[PDB]
Amino acid sequence: VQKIGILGAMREEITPILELFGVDFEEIPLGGNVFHKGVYHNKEIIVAYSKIGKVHSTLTTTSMILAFGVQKVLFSGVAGSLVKDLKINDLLVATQLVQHDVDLSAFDHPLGFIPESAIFIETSGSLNALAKKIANEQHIALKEGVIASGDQFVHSKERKEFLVSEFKASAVEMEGASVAFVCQKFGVPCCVLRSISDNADEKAGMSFDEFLEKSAHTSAKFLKSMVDEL
């Protein structure tokens, strides 16, 4: 039997996931998260929001894998755009992710690097290829690129410029890299999907509140379309 973990960071990001799947979910509390466990097209689906940021998302992903035995993890949510071609509501799949706020440069380590790890964490090529295939069938744009994750909500030109110069990131959020990292450590295939909610600039807070609902729904709808192919 196939077991698939579906994650968002905020409750608002999983609201449309639960609604779009529409099946009956059993609620299972563990480690301060609530896991929604259902069956859909012969697959067991386990849905949770982690809460915001790297520690929360690391915890929840580890719980998904260890406690619920998922074989794939699909993340859905919203993100800040760092590139002109990614506009509000546009979808991006992360081919690599970085923890942009990691700094061990005192020991001459490059920014983003931690010993016994790597700057860039890879996601599943087979899932990313699937995303590309179905986006083409749907005639919807889907960009591929690097996503930068850190424990700050980015809302300045200066920090955007750093993310582009240092990591060639296309989008910024606070959980993708930690989710992808956990999945790498456990050998679990991962896809990270984001819809743009803001431009990570001085107006980001306002844009985020305006577009969270729609952008979350766009990501969630696409995630469902991926699960339909598994």
Ligand X SMILES: Nc1ncnc2c(CN3C[C@H](CCSCCOCCO)[C@@H](O)C3)c[nH]c12
Which residues are identified as catalytic?
A: 13, 198
Task: Return all residues near 71 (Cβ < 8 A) that are at least 6 apart.
Answer: 2, 3, 4, 188, 189
Amino acid at 104: L
Contact by Cβ (8 Å): 167, 148: yes
Q: Does 56 bind a second copy (CB under 8 A)?
A: yes
Q: By CB under 6 A, name the binding residues for ligand X.
A: 9-10, 52, 78-80, 104, 107, 115, 153-155, 172-175, 197-198, 200, 204, 208
The answer to whether 96 contacts a second copy (rule: CB under 8 A) is no
Mark the binding-site residues for substrate, compressed into ranges.
80, 154, 174-175
Tell me which of ligand X, a second copy, none is bound by residue 29, counting a contact when its beta carbon lies within the kind-specific cut-off of 5 to 8 angstroms.
none
Stretch that binds a second copy, among 17-25, 100-108, 122-130, 132-140 (CB under 8 A): 100-108
From ligand X, a second copy, none, interface partner of 173 (C-beta below 5 to 8 A by class): ligand X
Give 37-43's long-range contacts (Cβ < 8 A, gap of 24+).
37/68, 40/227, 41/227, 41/228, 42/1, 42/2, 43/1, 43/2, 43/3, 43/4, 43/227, 43/230
Among 4, 48, 102, 119, binds a second copy (CB under 8 A): 102
Instruction: Give the one entry of a second copy, ligand X, none that residue 85 binds, where binding means its C-beta sits below a cut-off of 5 to 8 angstroms depending on kind.
Output: none
The tokens describing 90, both together, are 């546009």
Q: What tokens appear for 187 in the block?
A: 């050998």
